[PDB]
Amino acid sequence: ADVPAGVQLADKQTLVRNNGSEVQSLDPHKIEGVPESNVSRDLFEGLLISDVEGHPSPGVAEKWENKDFKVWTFHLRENAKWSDGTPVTAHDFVYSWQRLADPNTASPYASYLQYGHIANIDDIIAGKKPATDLGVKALDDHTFEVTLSEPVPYFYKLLVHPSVSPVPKSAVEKFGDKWTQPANIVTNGAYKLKNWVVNERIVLERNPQYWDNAKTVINQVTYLPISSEVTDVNRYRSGEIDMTYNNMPIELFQKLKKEIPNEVRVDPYLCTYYYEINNQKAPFNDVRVRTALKLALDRDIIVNKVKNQGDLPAYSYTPPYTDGAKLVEPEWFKWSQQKRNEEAKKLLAEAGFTADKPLTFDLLYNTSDLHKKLAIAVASIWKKNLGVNVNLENQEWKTFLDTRHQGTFDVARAGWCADYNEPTSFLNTMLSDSSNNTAHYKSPAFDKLIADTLKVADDTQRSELYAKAEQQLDKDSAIVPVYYYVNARLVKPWVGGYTGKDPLDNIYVKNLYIIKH
Ligand SMILES: [U]
Ligand SMILES: [U]
Ligand SMILES: [U]
Ligand SMILES: [U]
Ligand SMILES: [U]
Ligand SMILES: [U]
Ligand SMILES: [U]
Ligand SMILES: [U]
């Protein structure tokens, strides 16, 4: 943390943050969500990290170079250490990235190494080559070298993500799935795991072995798993919680902005809210059905009337303000909702649906006051505008993610937030073979458009190809875009260091501090 001259620090430097739900895991190769990543950043540190405003900056790697954007060499700082005092080396990274690639690990982020194009990854994921053939090597204890199969100018931006953080081989091998228990875990970020009570709390304490430990201010941070946004706000206002999670309750938001305006932080966020259609399941394998659902949803009502927190109506998957996005707004987005509804009803009529044999399916969402209110609104809109019936179903966060991976669903609410600020952070997740593809969408034309983006060595051709990739996704109605998120949360006046400038919201508790109050 960089405490400004003249600020007086509180005697007790502890922080309590709400974190939305119980995490899937603390193992960096088994996680895929925001709640998980929030804790991961305080515990595991990769080659690069985001600074307080979001810029890619030195992590374990203090400096790096590239040859032709294809061979990347990372010089690791000599004092990087794990919490047990052992050095962090390039061998930790070789083992870690191989473990991420290995199909036996079944990482939901195994495809992250395809997004960076590390050599031999396709073959490794397919089981044709062992994970030890991955294009990584330790040239020495402090030098990690990555070889890509084609030039990737933005490759280093990918490296702040939890999937490419190191994991401690000896703990993994000795304890298997219990390596992340407090008595067994070993970490290399600014914090160490002190306590982990499922469905109650996660408590982290400063890691004195962290190389940048002299600059860490917060000595302990607790992450809570509260999925009720009302309860989160209530426990913030009662004094228990210093930072809420960033899901705000429809019941209280407008009142909160009038009551404690300086605490309500609302900033740009590179996430898209959408309804994920299971593309492989009848009748959702019919484009007419997907298009109908997409069109009949009234984004103005959802965004301006039901949520009303500053989000923007969406007509794409990639947010239009992503660095490198120059998207073309489809004509259907400029039609009236009435015209959208007529087109929707006609397509369902064409698809074989009638008043007597209507379209009925499930709408799955992770337990939440906000997502339940949004799902109820969407259900009513779809009923009214299109004559479709939906059965709402809630599931705890971890189970919800697994259901979508299993494809044991019809439609599900969903949010994707960038991992790196570049359109492929979104678009690569719709590739046929992507491990993050829970839409179960498979388009050879879409796959080709993205594949062509690294075959050109020009930004304008790349941007035009992303725009066309979004047009292919839209033409196929792979998803139902709802809105581009704003990042809205409550933050006590005494929490310093949170700028709100990072559009990815990659917060590190090592960068915060408690002002005397
Ligand atoms: U004190
Ligand atoms: U106090
Ligand atoms: U470039
Ligand atoms: U650049
Ligand atoms: U940029
Ligand atoms: U269903
Ligand atoms: U509620
Ligand atoms: U106080």
Curated annotation (Swiss-Prot):
GO CC terms: ATP-binding cassette (ABC) transporter complex; outer membrane-bounded periplasmic space
Signal among keywords: yes
Spans through the membrane: none
An MF annotation (GO) of this entry: peptide transmembrane transporter activity
Annotated knockout phenotype: Mutant cannot take up cell wall peptides.
Record key words, sorted: Disulfide bond, Peptide transport, Periplasm, Protein transport, Signal, Transport
Localisation: Periplasm
SS bond partners: C271-C417
General function of this protein: Part of the ABC transporter complex OppABCDF involved in the uptake of oligopeptides, including the cell wall murein tripeptide L-alanyl-gamma-D-glutamyl-meso-diaminopimelate. Plays an important nutritional role and is involved in the recycling of cell wall peptides. Binds peptides containing from two to five amino acid residues regardless of their sequence. Also binds cell wall peptides, such as L-alanyl-gamma-D-glutamyl-meso-diaminopimelate.
Quaternary context: The complex is composed of two ATP-binding proteins (OppD and OppF), two transmembrane proteins (OppB and OppC) and a solute-binding protein (OppA).
Domain description: Accommodates the ligand side chains in large hydrated pockets which impose little specificity on binding. Tight binding is achieved by utilising the hydrogen-bonding potential of the main chain of the ligand.
Additional record remark: Isothermal titration calorimetric measurements of the binding of lysine-containing peptides of different lengths to OppA show that the dipeptide Lys-Lys is bound with 60-fold lower affinity than related tri- and tetrapeptides (Lys-Lys-Lys and Lys-Lys-Lys-Ala, respectively).
UniProt record similarity statement: Belongs to the bacterial solute-binding protein 5 family.
Protein name: Periplasmic oligopeptide-binding protein OppA
